[PDB]
Ligand binder design. Sequence first.
Ligand SMILES: Nc1nc2c(ncn2[C@@H]2O[C@H](COC(=O)NCc3ccccc3)[C@@H](O)[C@H]2O)c(=O)[nH]1
Ligand SMILES: [Cl-]
Lengths: 115, 112
Amino acid sequence: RPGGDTIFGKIIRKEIPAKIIFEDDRCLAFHDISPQAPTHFLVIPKKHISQISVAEDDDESLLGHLMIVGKKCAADLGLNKGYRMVVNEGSDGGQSVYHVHLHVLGGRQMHWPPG
Amino acid sequence: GDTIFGKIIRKEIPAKIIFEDDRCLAFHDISPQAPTHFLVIPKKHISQISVAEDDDESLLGHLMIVGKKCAADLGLNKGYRMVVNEGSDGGQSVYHVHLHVLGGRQMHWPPG
Ligand SMILES: Nc1nc2c(ncn2[C@@H]2O[C@H](COC(=O)NCc3ccccc3)[C@@H](O)[C@H]2O)c(=O)[nH]1
Ligand SMILES: [Cl-]
């Protein structure tokens, strides 16, 4: 099954419901079920890549597309004071789902350090 | 307007450079928030991610690929966190797009 069987692969194939913000042939943006800010969504590739550390050189356009879609969705959601984009890698990064994903958080002041 | 990151790209002030190519520069953060904390920045002056153009897509992805390669070279085998801040709520400190890469300790949740 295209996208794999992580929760995110299931969401891509409409097998598990999600609150979808934007969808194209390359990616999907949807709200996080455990939000850490008043607005907290995810942008994921439809292609399954387990983690950023194994992304290939030719994935550059796709990874950049996640950011472009993320910033467009943030504007569409009225995050006019800004937002934070996060990619978690591995154990120290706090990655819990091994399908690459970009978090976008806003609607409150984000603090430093970022975790 | 120019920023301190422009000065770093132009080699006018020092930074501990990790990697450079024709289109980006990676260097250690002067105010590190983890045992390893570096930045990957485009040489093109994009002020913030909110104004990035569609044609910049692959350049933005290039920052992430460079970041992950630098992280491996710096020994971050247990993982790391990549961050882009936008605007005041995002805590963006310099108005030149930059990818933070942090590791060498457990990163926590929420991410700020
Ligand atoms: N809509 C929807 N979102 C989901 C679902 N199952 C998971 N998620 C979200 O995926 C993200 C994965 O994040 C990471 O990999 N690291 C962040 C993290 C997570 C836990 C503890 C510490 C850090 C998390 O923020 C989840 O809330 C789902 O069924 N539906
Ligand atoms: Cl910043």
